[PDB]
Structure 1
Amino acid sequence: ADVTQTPRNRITKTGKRIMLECSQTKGHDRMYWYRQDPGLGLRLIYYSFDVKDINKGEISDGYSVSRQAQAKFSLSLESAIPNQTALYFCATSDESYGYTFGSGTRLTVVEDLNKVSPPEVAVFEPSEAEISHTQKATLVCLATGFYPDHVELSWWVNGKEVHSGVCTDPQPLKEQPALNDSRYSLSSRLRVSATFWQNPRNHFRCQVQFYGLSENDEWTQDRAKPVTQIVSAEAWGRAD
């Protein structure tokens, strides 16, 4: 169908019951919940061929499901634990293996919400030596001190998103690798021609969308409540 999933992103504390919802418009008998993890592909949790027909997949422990309607298949994390952090995908199928996947739910389970923290973001300006040597100019964005690892980084030139000339690290690194709740860091590069960087009218912004707490989460610390938010850094072009 239009297969749709909710929510798209979610952060939760451990020990909570969390519900994901899949809905379809085509009324196919067969509906599925999978999880995706790096190096493991997509693993089946549970599936259903009709209202009240429910079948375990390979990783059903810790989850339950309900098939409330022809159109709806719900997944619950019964008592969330950190290793249920994953990208979750529901699917439908026709009678001939024609699958349709929802767009996914990115779920992160953390032990302690007190550790949630938005990134600090900085842009590092191109080197004069690069400009002289190559007639190109590389900007670097660094996002640091964030937790959990649940961000989206983009670049914006004169107010429009750019993809050309960009490379972002595929996963953040741990600032303190020995710690289970280490904060994270992420870098990205945007390379332009020297002459484009040398125009003082040109504006360069990296943007980091951070997913964290919501307005109904309790917050007891003096520091800023670490809500879902955008953090950016900027630089203007320059000749001198």
Structure 2
Amino acid sequence: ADVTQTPRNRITKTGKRIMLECSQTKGHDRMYWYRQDPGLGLRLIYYSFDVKDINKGEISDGYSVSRQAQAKFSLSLESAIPNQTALYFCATSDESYGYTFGSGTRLTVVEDLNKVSPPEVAVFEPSEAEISHTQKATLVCLATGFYPDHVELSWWVNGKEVHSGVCTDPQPLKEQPALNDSRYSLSSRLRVSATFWQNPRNHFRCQVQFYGLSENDEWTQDRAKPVTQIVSAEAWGRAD
């Protein structure tokens, strides 16, 4: 109970067997695998009270498990499908509902890896009119043309990550809503004092961590292989 799960993030194609692993150090009899999906909370897949006991939860179909040791509880997707895309959480409990949750596994099942695509990222500089009207300056970052919907956006000002003054869209939007494999786009804002923006010494960077293909994956297209990678855009302050 340092409860640890692996992997942390994973993209897979439909039809593959995928294995998620939960380990603990405290040797609690009781271990669990849940999935989280928006609007549904955390739903139980399987659970186990000892190396000799496996029990279905509410959504066990499509999944199997193995309790290979007191310390370890394995979840498998036998043949992955897209509606298995989810955040997966394992947990242990003592004998009084004292749960310990692992930090999560974000799994995305895609039908065709040819559609995987890293974002294009651009920074848009503050309006003169905002600066004049408010004495504040809002930068906008746009990440576009990405697939699957599996990114993390951050802002960096002098090489340190910043949370203040930031707002990032909670979910990306679909570029072509009528398409099952539409690409996605995501925006963020970073607002500073017009003073801070005004300093032509200050450097601003929007960074997008993209999760895509691994070195293992075959790639047959002329375009860049769309591997897990960081894509940034930058701007400097202007005197004006």
Aligned length: 240
8 Å contact from structure 1 (residues 67, 73) kept in 2:
yes
Q: CA RMSD in A?
A: 0.3
Mapping for residues 76-91 of structure 1, pairs under 5 Å? 76-91=76-91
8 Å contact from structure 1 (residues 174, 185) kept in 2:
yes
Deviation at 1:143, TM superposition (A): 0.1
8 Å contact from structure 1 (residues 136, 192) kept in 2:
yes
Aligned residue for 1:131, secondary structure, equals helix
Q: For residues 28-74 of structure 1, what are the alpha-carbon distances to aligned partners after superposition, in whole Å with 9 as ceiling and x for unaligned?
A: 00000000000000000000000020000000000000000000000
The percentage of counterpart residues that share the same residue type is 100
Deviation at 1:19, TM superposition (A): 0.1
Aligned residue for 1:132, secondary structure, equals helix
8 Å contact from structure 1 (residues 197, 238) kept in 2:
yes
8 Å contact from structure 1 (residues 13, 110) kept in 2:
yes
Deviation at 1:85, TM superposition (A): 0.1
Residue of structure 2 equivalent to 1:7 = 7
Deviation at 1:199, TM superposition (A): 0.1
Q: Does 1:195 align with 2:195?
A: yes
Structure 1: tracts of 5 or more residues without a match: none
Structure 2: tracts of 5 or more residues without a match: none
Q: Distance in 1 between matches of 2:44 and 2:203?
A: 46
Give TM-score, length-normalised by structure 2: 1.00
Aligned residue for 1:117, secondary structure, equals coil
Aligned residue for 2:32, secondary structure, equals strand
Q: Distance in 2 between matches of 1:237 and 1:226?
A: 32
Deviation at 1:81, TM superposition (A): 0.3
Q: Distance in 1 between matches of 2:52 and 2:231?
A: 46
Q: Distance in 1 between matches of 2:237 and 2:158?
A: 11
Q: Distance in 2 between matches of 1:207 and 1:75?
A: 33
8 Å contact from structure 1 (residues 15, 80) kept in 2:
yes
Aligned residue for 2:170, secondary structure, equals coil
Q: Distance in 1 between matches of 2:49 and 2:106?
A: 25
Aligned residue for 2:167, secondary structure, equals strand
Q: Distance in 2 between matches of 1:52 and 1:174?
A: 46
Q: Distance in 1 between matches of 2:178 and 2:191?
A: 34
Q: Distance in 2 between matches of 1:52 and 1:135?
A: 67
Deviation at 1:10, TM superposition (A): 0.1
8 Å contact from structure 1 (residues 123, 139) kept in 2:
yes
Residue of structure 1 equivalent to 2:143 = 143
Deviation at 1:239, TM superposition (A): 1.1
Q: Distance in 1 between matches of 2:45 and 2:74?
A: 12
Residue of structure 1 equivalent to 2:56 = 56
Aligned residue for 1:196, secondary structure, equals helix
Q: Distance in 1 between matches of 2:73 and 2:42?
A: 18
Q: For residues 159-184 of structure 1, what are the alpha-carbon distances to aligned partners after superposition, in whole Å with 9 as ceiling and x for unaligned?
A: 00000000000000000000000000
Q: For residues 129-180 of structure 1, what are the alpha-carbon distances to aligned partners after superposition, in whole Å with 9 as ceiling and x for unaligned?
A: 0000000000000000000000000000010000000000000000000000
8 Å contact from structure 1 (residues 5, 23) kept in 2:
yes
Q: Distance in 1 between matches of 2:148 and 2:113?
A: 9
Aligned residue for 2:20, secondary structure, equals strand
> Runs of 4 or more off by more than 6 Å in structure 1?
none
Give TM-score, length-normalised by structure 1: 1.00
Q: For residues 183-224 of structure 1, what are the alpha-carbon distances to aligned partners after superposition, in whole Å with 9 as ceiling and x for unaligned?
A: 000000000000100000000000000000000000000000
8 Å contact from structure 1 (residues 52, 66) kept in 2:
no
Aligned residue for 1:59, secondary structure, equals coil
Aligned residue for 1:67, secondary structure, equals strand
Residue of structure 1 equivalent to 2:44 = 44
